[PDB]
């Protein structure tokens, strides 16, 4: 069973942990990857009810199981905060334009 389901993409807790650790490490060194510069601030315009405090940073999680390193980021993202605490897993799938919805 999926721990997080973003549309057709199925992710386990280890998939999320691996992605988060990669993005947080980059955040710490103050470095970015990709043309859209990941990771970067997630403003939470959607107003999701997160259990942890802001600021939030988004980092893409890939269905291939690879750690993001550039190019198309896909539709899924892991959102973590300053203390490397998982805020949630979100996706562009099933959401209008460039909005997000939470993965079930
Ligand atoms: N939809 C959305 N985008 C945000 C938010 N905060 C920052 N952004 C950035 O603006 C862009 C609008 O889609 C997003 O790019 P993304 O597709 O790479 O996630 C995202 O990086 C937010 O709260 N909601
Ligand atoms: Ca997996």
Residue with tokens 């203390």: 83
| C-beta of residue 89 within 8 angstroms of C-beta of residue 4 | yes
**CA dist 77 → 19, 27, 63 (Å):** 9, 15, 11
The 10 Å Cβ neighbour count of residue 56 is 20
Q: Which residues contact 70 (CB under 8 A, 6 or more apart)?
A: 33, 34, 35
Torsional class of 53: left (φ above 0), alpha (ψ -120 to 50), beta (otherwise): beta
Enumerate helices (H) and strands (E) in the chain, giving the number of each. 1, 7
User: Hey, whose CA ends up nearest to atom 24 of ligand 1?
Assistant: 45
- Ligand 1 pocket check for 42: Cβ under 6 Å: yes
- All structural domains of the chain: 1-104 (3.10.450.30)
The enclosing H or E element of 90 equals strand 86-91
User: Hey, whose CA ends up nearest to atom 15 of ligand 1?
Assistant: 98
| C-beta of residue 57 within 8 angstroms of C-beta of residue 40 | yes
Cα–Cα distance between 86 and 92 in angstroms, integer?
18
């Amino acid at each position: 069973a999926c721990d997080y389901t973003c549309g057709s993409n199925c992710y386990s807790s280890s998939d999320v942990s691996t992605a988060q650790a990669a993005g947080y490490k980059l955040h710490e060194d103050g470095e970015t990857v990709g043309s859209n510069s990941y990771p970067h601030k997630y403003n939470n315009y959607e107003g999701f009810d997160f259990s942890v405090s802001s600021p939030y940073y988004e980092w893409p999680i890939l269905s291939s199981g690879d750690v993001y390193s550039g190019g198309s980021p896909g539709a899924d993202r892991v959102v973590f905060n300053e203390n490397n605490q998982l805020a949630g897993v979100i996706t562009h799938t099933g959401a209008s334009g460039n909005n997000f919805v939470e993965c079930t």
